[PDB]
């Protein structure tokens, strides 16, 4: 029964601290929230299963930050904003498979191969991060400072190659 409470303990703390910090430098502050919660406090005990919660929570924060960058990206992508996603997701690649969401999207993705290679060549995350790279996020990266175009090479192959 104590094992059941330990499993449910790591479970409810996993979803708790997971969705707690679920809501650049703010993700680096979330990586500093990954410092204070995981890499300082939880690192003391778990060089184990926080190593599993490097997958079960933190690559589930690359799955969760994946789908956060893959739901529908309104205006958080540009030549600086998605370059700040390199300060978020390629900074999540600072440690070994989390180079996903800043790949093939960080440079104001609004091209045919930026959308279609945001689907087929922005991998290690889910492939919903093309419509949230060049369909919402190139009418929205085109709506962002450092615009690159609301193309149908962007929006059509981003809403088509992904979906």
Swiss-Prot record:
Subcellular location: Cytoplasm; Cell membrane
Misc. comment: Present with 4280 molecules/cell in log phase SD medium.
Role of this protein: Component of the exocyst complex involved in the docking of exocytic vesicles with fusion sites on the plasma membrane.
Subunit annotation: The exocyst complex is composed of SEC3, SEC5, SEC6, SEC8, SEC10, SEC15, EXO70 and EXO84. Interacts with SEC4.
Family affiliation: Belongs to the SEC15 family.
Entry protein name: Exocyst complex component SEC15
Natural source organism: Saccharomyces cerevisiae (strain ATCC 204508 / S288c)
The encoding gene: SEC15
Residues of the full protein shown: 659 to 890 of 910
